[PDB]
Amino acid sequence: MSASVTVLWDKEIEGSNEVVKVDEMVASNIKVEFYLKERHFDRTITHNITLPRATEVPIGTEIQLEPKHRLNGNTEPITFTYGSLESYTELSEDKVTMPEFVEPKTKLIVILTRNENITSAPVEISVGDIKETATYICQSQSGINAEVNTEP
DSSP states (O other): OOOEEEEEEGEEEEEEEEEEEEEEEEEEOOBBSOOOOOOEEEEEEEEEEEETOOSOOOOOEEEOOSSSSSSSTTTSOEEEEEEBOEEEEEEEEEEEEOOOOOTTTTEEEEEEEEEEEEEEEEEEEEEEEEEEEEEEEEEEEEEEEOOOOOOO
């Protein structure tokens, strides 16, 4: 009930790829400190395994794989179970330092962005004499960048 697993990373597909504006914070001066010292965000990577509708892989088969994109320095494999656990989400805290002050005669804008990417790859599975090519999907978020612009 434990499959042999090989991900075909050289066949990876670049799905959605975007730079997402998470938020903006604006302030104006005439030298006050900023609202927050740091902002805290949730950052996730979601790992999914998908199988053909008509697959021979038995329900309950365990499928262990090691993704490319991980959080928290985690390195242990993800264990999916076909028919009951097909998605796993990593979560980390992304802490972003804010500008300390608004300099004199300044309007300050913080633009917060991160990369968000979907990638997918074939997964060759064998359990006994049953062979299948499943599809692995990674929905990842990068760390957040803060761009501080000073205006009139």
